[PDB]
Structure 1
Amino acid sequence: AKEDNIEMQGTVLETLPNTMFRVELENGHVVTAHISGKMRKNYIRILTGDKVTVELTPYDLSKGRIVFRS
């Protein structure tokens, strides 16, 4: 019933305070992503250079949620 997200791969270009990250996506746009709750709860660390899946919203293409780290 909720509106759908846009999943997209990207590389973490820098880490920011409190589990915030710059992530350059496939399309080349740099979004300020934050960690998912599930990844926070399960303690999956994210680092500069890590390849991440990012859920984006059409309401804002400068922001995302990192849902997976590969």
Structure 2
Amino acid sequence: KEDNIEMQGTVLETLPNTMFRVELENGHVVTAHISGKMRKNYIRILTGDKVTVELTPYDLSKGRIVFRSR
């Protein structure tokens, strides 16, 4: 594997099939989707949550949500 970048952000609005538009700490808008661990653990995400997204050098347009926070 190769190291990925991690960042903190907020969910602006939800899209069908657990896909979201997310604003990051640096101010870029990125489309994100849910990790399988959440799909097991029945954690739910709605607008206004503080969440962690990892991104990849290959594509910065799309990121992934991996941790939900209060």
Shift of 1:15: 0.4
Q: Residue 61 of structure 2: SS of its match in structure 1?
A: strand
Alignment: residue pair count: 69
What is the deviation of 1:4? 1.0
Q: How far, CA to CA, are the matches of 1:37 and 1:65 in structure 2?
A: 11
Q: TM-score, normalised by structure 2?
A: 0.95
Q: Unpaired runs of 5+ in structure 2?
A: none
The share of aligned pairs that are identical, in percent, is 100
Deviation at 1:45, TM superposition (A): 0.2
Q: Which stretches of structure 1, 4 residues or longer, exceed 4 Å deviation after superposition?
A: none
Q: Where do 5+ consecutive residues of structure 1 fail to align?
A: none
CA RMSD of aligned residues (A): 0.6
Q: State TM-score, norm by structure 1.
A: 0.95
> Which residue in the other structure is 2:50 paired with?
51
